[model samples]
Target: HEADVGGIFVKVSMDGAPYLRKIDLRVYGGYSELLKALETMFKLTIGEYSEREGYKGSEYAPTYEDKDGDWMLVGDVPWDMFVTSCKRLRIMKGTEAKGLGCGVGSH
Candidate 1:
């Protein structure tokens, strides 16, 4: 399918996994659906909480493009955001108690 071929590719990382994997998808959809898929795929409780406490399962898809070199703005608001660099956007899923994230590379 031409549409399928045009779908964006991404590197996904999950908790407890030692390596990252690649995925080809057309778009990033609803939040709940994303969490469900992450739960099923990564085999982790995405996030579970109540009004008594804040949600432990936090989610994000921040997009970090080349900030020329030093600083950059990120937002995975997926609009089919795709590029040719492996260092582009990434898919992430983590627990509620432990907020998920990554940092810049060191020197």
Candidate 2:
């Protein structure tokens, strides 16, 4: 299933906080591509997170869990599942994370 004005909708939180990040992607070539976008988003927002630090790329990275399920390897998710959101994933960094400092949509 596709859309005339289709795009992937994402609502990601930084581990835990009082805010949520939203992204609407119209072009998604694959999983690795999403990682690249996330890389850019982190650069534009949270200065602490970068591919240079941890979970460097798509293949090998820290396990991401959300709610009562795992959200790791979300890049591998198909376009259908890729566009889903509100999972509330925990982006753990050996016991570290971020918040509204996220530059994209801060408030």
The number of the candidate with the highest lDDT is 2
Worst 10 residues of 2 by lDDT: 98-107
lDDT of each: 0.37, 0.39
Residue range 1-107, candidate 1, lDDT tens digits: 23444355655553443646555444434334544554566555544322222222345222233324321223233324423322443434333113323332111
Compose the digit string of candidate 2's lDDT tens values, residues 1-107. Answer: 34523353545555423445565544554455555655554453222224234332322232234334644434334545544532433333322322221232111
Candidate 1: residue 67 lDDT (0-100)? 25
Give the TM-scores of the predictions, in the order they appear: 0.39, 0.41
Off-target runs (Cα >4 Å) in candidate 1 are 1-6, 14-17, 25-29, 48-107
What candidate 2 gets wrong by more than 4 Å, as runs, is 1-8, 16-19, 44-69, 75-107
* lDDT of the structure predicted as candidate 2: 0.39
